[PDB]
Design a protein around this ligand. Structure first.
Ligand code: CL
Ligand code: CL
Ligand code: MG
Ligand code: MG
Ligand code: NA
Ligand code: NA
Lengths: 6, 236, 236, 6
C-alpha cells in the first residue's frame, strides 16, 4: 500500500 | 552532538544541499542537529526533517524486507541449512532501523511535540510519531509488539482528532495522516475494513471541499487523494 | 577490524546478502573483512569486492558532482554570497570519497596485488588501482594532482601490458580495462585522441575474435564492446 | 562517458 510522500 | 558547533542556519542550508545530492543520512544528521538547537521548526524545516528520515528509514525497510523474505524461505521444508548468517544480518539491519526510529521518536519527545501548539505543527509531529511506531511495528515480534502497535494507534488517533477539529478536509497533512492511519489499519492492526472505511470517507470529504481551493492547493490535495484511491483499488 | 571475529565464508555470504538488499556500504565492509583474512580472492569474490566499492564510491562521486556544480555557480559573477557552507559540505563529501579510495588502494597494496600471479587476477587488481586513482584524480586540485594522474596511468599501463600478452582481445576484464583507460585519457589526461584511438582499436580487435566464443561469452564481450561504441559516438 | 560495469 502507498503511504504519504514527504 | 557532532553538530553542536554548527549554526542552526548552516545546518538547514546543508540539509538542503544534502537533499540535492541524495545524501539522506547526512541530511538527517543535519536536521537532527537543527532540532537539537531547541527552537521550534518552521513548516519548511519540518518537511526537511521528514524527507531526511523517510529516505533513511525507507532504505532500511526495503533492505529488511529483502532479508526477511530470504530468511523465511530458509525456514521452509526442504531448504538446505545455511547457518546463522541470514538471521544475523537481518537482525543487524533490524537493529539499525530500530535505532533510527528511536532517534526520531526521541526528537519528537524531546521536545518537538510539547512545544507544538498550532494544529499544523502538532498534527505533523503526532503523525510522525505514529509513522515511526508503525515502522517499529513492521519488525516487532516479541512481548511488546502489542504495546508498539497501541503507541502508533494512540499517536495517529490524537493527530486525527486535532486535524478533524482544526483543519479542512483537503489539508495535505490531514490527508497524508489519514492515508497513513489507513495503512496502519490494513497492514499492522489486521483491520482491513477500518482501513477501507477511513480511506473512502477521507477521499469523499476532500472531494466535497476541493471547490474552495486555488489551483495550486487543488494540485496538492488531489495528489494525496489519488494515493487513497490507489489503495482502495488495491484493497477492493 | 570489526570483521576480525567473523568467518571468511560468513563474510562472503553476508556480502551477497547485502548486495541483494542494496546495502553496499555493508557489502564493502564485509568484503574488506574477507580480504583482510589474508587469503587470495576467487574470481567471484573479486567481483563482489568490485561491486561493493563501485556502488559506494559511485554514490559519493554523484554527490560530489552535484555539490561541485553548486559551488561553481556560487562563484560566478552576480551570485549572492551564501557563506562557507557549500565549500564545507563539498569538502566533507570529498574527504569521505578520498577515504574510500584510500581504503581500496590500501587493500590492493596490502597485499592483493603482490600475491596475484595469474593474469586474470593481476589485471583485475591493477585495473582497480587505476580506477581508484582515477576517482582521486576527478577531485584533485593541488600540488599532487599530477602524481595522482601518473599513478592511475602507471597502473592502467601495467594492466594493459599484461592483458595484451596473456588474454584474448575479447576477455571482459581486458575490455573493461581498455574502456576505463580510454575514459582516463579523455576525462583525466586531456588526451581525447588517445582515448578515441584506444576505444576503436580495442573494439576492432575484439570484433575479429568474437567468432571463437560460445554464445554466453559472446554476450559478455559484446556488452562491453557496446560501451566502447557508445563512448565513440559521444566523442566523435 | 561510460566506464566498465561491475
Ligand atoms: Cl551481521
Ligand atoms: Cl559539512
Ligand atoms: Mg538438500
Ligand atoms: Mg544580489
Ligand atoms: Na553459513
Ligand atoms: Na550561509
Amino acid at each position: 500500500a502507498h503511504s504519504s510522500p514527504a | 552532538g557532532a553538530m553542536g558547533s554548527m549554526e542552526r542556519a548552516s545546518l538547514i542550508q546543508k540539509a538542503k544541499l544534502a537533499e540535492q545530492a541524495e545524501r539522506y543520512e547526512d541530511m538527517a544528521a543535519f536536521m537532527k542537529g537543527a532540532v537539537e538547537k531547541g527552537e521550534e521548526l518552521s513548516c519548511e524545516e519540518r518537511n526537511l526533517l521528514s524527507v531526511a528520515y523517510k529516505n533513511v528509514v525507507g532504505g532500511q525497510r526495503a533492505a529488511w524486507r529483502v532479508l526477511s523474505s530470504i530468511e523465511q524461505k530458509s525456514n521452509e521444508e526442504g531448504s538446505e541449512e545455511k547457518g546463522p548468517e541470514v538471521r544475523e544480518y537481518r537482525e543487524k539491519v533490524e537493529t539499525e532501523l530500530q535505532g533510527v526510529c528511536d532517534t526520531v521518536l526521541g526528537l519528537l519527545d524531546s521536545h518537538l511535540i510539547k512545544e507544538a501548539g498550532d494544529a499544523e505543527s502538532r498534527v505533523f509531529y503526532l503523525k510522525m510519531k505514529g509513522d515511526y511506531y508503525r515502522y517499529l511495528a513492521e519488525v516487532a515480534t516479541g512481548d511488546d509488539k502489542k504495546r508498539i502497535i497501541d503507541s502508533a494507534r494512540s499517536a495517529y488517533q490524537e493527530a486525527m482528532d486535532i486535524s478533524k477539529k482544526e483543519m479542512p478536509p483537503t489539508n495535505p497533512i490531514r490527508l497524508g495522516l489519514a492515508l497513513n492511519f489507513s495503512v496502519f489499519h490494513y497492514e499492522i492492526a489486521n483491520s482491513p475494513e477500518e482501513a477501507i472505511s477511513l480511506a473512502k470517507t477521507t477521499f469523499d470529504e476532500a472531494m466535497a471541499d476541493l471547490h474552495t481551493l486555488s489551483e495550486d492547493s487543488y494540485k496538492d490535495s488531489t495528489l494525496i487523494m489519488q494515493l487513497l484511491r490507489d489503495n482502495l483499488t488495491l484493497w477492493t
